[PDB]
Amino acid sequence: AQSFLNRVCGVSAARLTPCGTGTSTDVVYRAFDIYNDKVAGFAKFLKTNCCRFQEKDEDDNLIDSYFVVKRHTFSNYQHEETIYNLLKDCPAVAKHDFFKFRIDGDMVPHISRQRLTKYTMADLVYALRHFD
Amino acid sequence: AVGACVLCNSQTSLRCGACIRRPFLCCKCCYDHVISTSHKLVLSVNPYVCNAPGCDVTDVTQLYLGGMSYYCKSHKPPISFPLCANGQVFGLYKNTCVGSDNVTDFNAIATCDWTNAGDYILANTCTERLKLFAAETLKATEETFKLSYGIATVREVLSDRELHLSWEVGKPRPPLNRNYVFTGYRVTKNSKVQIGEYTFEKGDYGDAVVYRGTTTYKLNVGDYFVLTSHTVMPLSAPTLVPQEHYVRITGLYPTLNISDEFSSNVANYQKVGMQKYSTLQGPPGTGKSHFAIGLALYYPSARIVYTACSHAAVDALCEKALKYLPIDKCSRIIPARARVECFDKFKVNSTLEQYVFCTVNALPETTADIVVFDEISMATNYDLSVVNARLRAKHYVYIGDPAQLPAPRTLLTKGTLEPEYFNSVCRLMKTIGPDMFLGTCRRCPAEIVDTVSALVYDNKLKAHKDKSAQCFKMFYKGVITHDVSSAINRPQIGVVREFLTRNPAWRKAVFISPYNSQNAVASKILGLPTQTVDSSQGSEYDYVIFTQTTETAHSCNVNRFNVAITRAKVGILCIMSDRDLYDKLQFTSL
Ligand SMILES: [Zn+2]
Ligand SMILES: [Zn+2]
Ligand SMILES: [Zn+2]
Numbered sequence: 001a002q003s004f005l006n007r008v009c010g011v012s013a014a015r016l017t018p019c020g021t022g023t024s025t026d027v028v029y030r031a032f033d034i035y036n037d038k039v040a041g042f043a044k045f046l047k048t049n050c051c052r053f054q055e056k057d058e059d060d061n062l063i064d065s066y067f068v069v070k071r072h073t074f075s076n077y078q079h080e081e082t083i084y085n086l087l088k089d090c091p092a093v094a095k096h097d098f099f100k101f102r103i104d105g106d107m108v109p110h111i112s113r114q115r116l117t118k119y120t121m122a123d124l125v126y127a128l129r130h131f132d
Numbered sequence: 133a134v135g136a137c138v139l140c141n142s143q144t145s146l147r148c149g150a151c152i153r154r155p156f157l158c159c160k161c162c163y164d165h166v167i168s169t170s171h172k173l174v175l176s177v178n179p180y181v182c183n184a185p186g187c188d189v190t191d192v193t194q195l196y197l198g199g200m201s202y203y204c205k206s207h208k209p210p211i212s213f214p215l216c217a218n219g220q221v222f223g224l225y226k227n228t229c230v231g232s233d234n235v236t237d238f239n240a241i242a243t244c245d246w247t248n249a250g251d252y253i254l255a256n257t258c259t260e261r262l263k264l265f266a267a268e269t270l271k272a273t274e275e276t277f278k279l280s281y282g283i284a285t286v287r288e289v290l291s292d293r294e295l296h297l298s299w300e301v302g303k304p305r306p307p308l309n310r311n312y313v314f315t316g317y318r319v320t321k322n323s324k325v326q327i328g329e330y331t332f333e334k335g336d337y338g339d340a341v342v343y344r345g346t347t348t349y350k351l352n353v354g355d356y357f358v359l360t361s362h363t364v365m366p367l368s369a370p371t372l373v374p375q376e377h378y379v380r381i382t383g384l385y386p387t388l389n390i391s392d393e394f395s396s397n398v399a400n401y402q403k404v405g406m407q408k409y410s411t412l413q414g415p416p417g418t419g420k421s422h423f424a425i426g427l428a429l430y431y432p433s434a435r436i437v438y439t440a441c442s443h444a445a446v447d448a449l450c451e452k453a454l455k456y457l458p459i460d461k462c463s464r465i466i467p468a469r470a471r472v473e474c475f476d477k478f479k480v481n482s483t484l485e486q487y488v489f490c491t492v493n494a495l496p497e498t499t500a501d502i503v504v505f506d507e508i509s510m511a512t513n514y515d516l517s518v519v520n521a522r523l524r525a526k527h528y529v530y531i532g533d534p535a536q537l538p539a540p541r542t543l544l545t546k547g548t549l550e551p552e553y554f555n556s557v558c559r560l561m562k563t564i565g566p567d568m569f570l571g572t573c574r575r576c577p578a579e580i581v582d583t584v585s586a587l588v589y590d591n592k593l594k595a596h597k598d599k600s601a602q603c604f605k606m607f608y609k610g611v612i613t614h615d616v617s618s619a620i621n622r623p624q625i626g627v628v629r630e631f632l633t634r635n636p637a638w639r640k641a642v643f644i645s646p647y648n649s650q651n652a653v654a655s656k657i658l659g660l661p662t663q664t665v666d667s668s669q670g671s672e673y674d675y676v677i678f679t680q681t682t683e684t685a686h687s688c689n690v691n692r693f694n695v696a697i698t699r700a701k702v703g704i705l706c707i708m709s710d711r712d713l714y715d716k717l718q719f720t721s722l
Contacts, residue, residue, distance in 0.1 A: 037292050075476050082480070 004101055008053065008069050008112055015056045016067065023103050025049045031126040066116045077109035137161050138261055140232035146223045149173025151242050153269045158229045163221040166192055169239050176223060182207060192221060241266050246273060249547035256553050260370055267514035268364055274543060275361035281306045284357040294335055295343040295351055306359055307617055308332040309648055310471045314357040330357060331471050334616060334649060336656050369521035371513045371556050376408045382526065385433035394426030400568045401430045409528035411557065413566030415593060416533050416698045417573035417672065421449055424504055425456045428487065432457065437488035439495055440506035445670040446489055447475040457487065465490035497522040506670065508532030508557045512539055530557060535589065536669065537691045572596065575672035576700050579603060583717050588694045602703035603719035609709050612682050620650040621681045624707050629658050638703065641675035644668065644696060650681055665696055672699050678706035
């Protein structure tokens with residue numbers, strides 16, 4: 001419940017408002033480029049597994065700073081933890097965080113990305129190369 | 133680069149050429165070996181050839197010093213002496229060559245083909261160092277044999293993961309599995325480079341094969357895949373450490389009032405603590421995994437490492453320790469390849485742990501306090517001394533069972549290998565008996581233990597549970613088609629597909645097939661939990677399905693069947709085609 005919000009918001013301020021709905025994964029419409037045997041292209045898609053929490057500022061004014069937290073399998077958890085542990089020095093990598101919450105009697109893994117931007121670069125490119 | 137001899141262990145530095153492993157030999161010892169055996173090449177600080185370019189004599193029988201180099205009779209200078217010693221071979225150090233005569237056994241070791249059981253049984257009867265040499269040279273022979281395997285000259289590729297396979301003519305085309313390793317080489321009149329470490333398994337249906345590799349291109353026509361061999365490392369440590377008895381404990385931290393199932397085994401644990409080491413002789417299914425867990429519970433204070441031969445056994449042990457022991461003190465060491473999946477829940481290769489787990493071929497060179505290893509039939513004498521060398525602890529624990537199947541030993545194709553002669557430990561455990569014995573199985577109910585005790589075992593075995601009344605059988609034959617190596621009995625698969633629905637709680641029943649082709653095609657057809665005998669064993673499953681394809685020494689093996697049926701928990705159903713074996717058991721026919 002709210003303890004999930006408390007755990008996700010680790011140390012950096014506490015100005016969070018859930019744009020999702022508690023533990024529900026808010027769905028959005030975002031552009032993607034993907035190529036994997038079954039499909040190939042560069043088009044729009046529907047993003048599903050993303051609990052988006054926009055961080056506001058003092059006076060509760062919203063600002064562009066989003067804490068995306070995602071749930072996935074267990075092997076991926078260790079794999080991404082290891083690789084991020086390798087590369088956690090270059091200033092070009094967004095700060096990560098790894099933990100497992102108990103929504104129910106389940107040890108579900110969680111991955112936390114802090115201070116992101118609302119739109120990626122693919123959205124900006126796709127908005128100009130498919131103008132209308 | 134000098135050492136002792138092997139037969140007499142005297143200080144010398146000569147090695148034989150024809151002997152593949154090239155071991156240190158003394159003057160008289162090597163002289164006798166070359167006199168008896170056809171080995172006509174000796175290696176030294178320099179090779180032994182007729183130094184004259186107009187000659188190419190390499191036989192140690194005749195080679196004459198040309199003052200500073202070796203010559204033949206047709207090139208021998210006048211003031212010069214032959215270097216065939218007085219009933220010896222001239223070389224380095226002669227005045228301290230202690231005598232030893234038992235060379236004929238070593239002569240046979242370097243002569244026999246390892247195709248007859250006599251070779252293997254005799255190799256388990258020589259000296260310690262002779263045993264190590266025999267094991268290493270057998271390993272090298274196996275590696276050379278698998279190196280001389282088929283070169284898969286392919287022509288087509290189906291998909292980004294599926295390809296079409298074909299081989300050359302003349303060399304043994306190996307089967308396809310994740311255990312093997314292959315690599316393609318692009319032949320463009322140049323750039324014969326490795327395209328990635330490729331492992332291969334047969335596709336789903338027809339002339340379709342799935343290709344997977346470290347890298348992944350879309351393979352061309354002209355390339356091919358060759359099986360490469362891995363080098364064999366020499367070893368020094370003894371296969372078995374000596375025994376020493378004691379009076380009091382050897383410094384272990386007990387846990388008062390921890391459990392109940394292992395209080396009765398505390399006497400056994402202290403008997404282990406009375407000695408340098410201890411072994412285990414018991415039938416499978418006796419919960420020896422949980423017995424080892426409780427033994428760890430007796431002294432769970434030191435920083436320990438454990439290991440097992442295969443993956444399924446060590447994964448089940450990891451699960452058992454997780455269930456009993458606290459989680460964040462045990463780890464499982466995984467290999468770099470990891471082409472076979474493992475316990476993907478624990479620490480990923482965290483060597484800095486208190487009760488570590490690993491595999492035989494991925495063990496480190498660290499040290500510990502106590503240790504246990506799974507199965508001695510699965511292990512040879514080479515790995516015993518290997519782990520003796522790399523790991524050195526104060527106490528050692530070993531487990532095993534005579535009624536398990538031994539290591540493959542593909543080169544041994546004639547006769548049957550006695551269970552005591554599977555390794556040195558097997559002979560010791562059949563000669564002096566057990567250190568502690570446990571003959572009650574918790575996995576299987578009364579009917580299965582009665583059948584196994586009556587049929588293959590001695591009439592001594594017992595259990596604790598009554599019959600589950602889930603016994604069934606079938607006999608009709610079905611036809612095969614001579615597939616890769618062996619074949620698949622497809623009509624039985626169709627019958628099982630049609631019939632299964634009536635059995636409600638059998639959708640997760642563990643399908644059994646020792647043959648990879650059938651093991652895969654069964655999951656291709658419907659998707660039952662697939663499994664083979666080797667990947668089975670040591671464990672137990674609630675619902676199991678056994679399938680015998682046809683009749684053959686492999687499929688009619690009593691040991692294979694009995695170790696297969698020792699894995700039933702609450703229900704099982706087996707198909708079969710043999711008549712007297714069908715009459716042998718004491719279950720419901722249907
Ligand atoms: Zn030789
Ligand atoms: Zn000698
Ligand atoms: Zn000559």
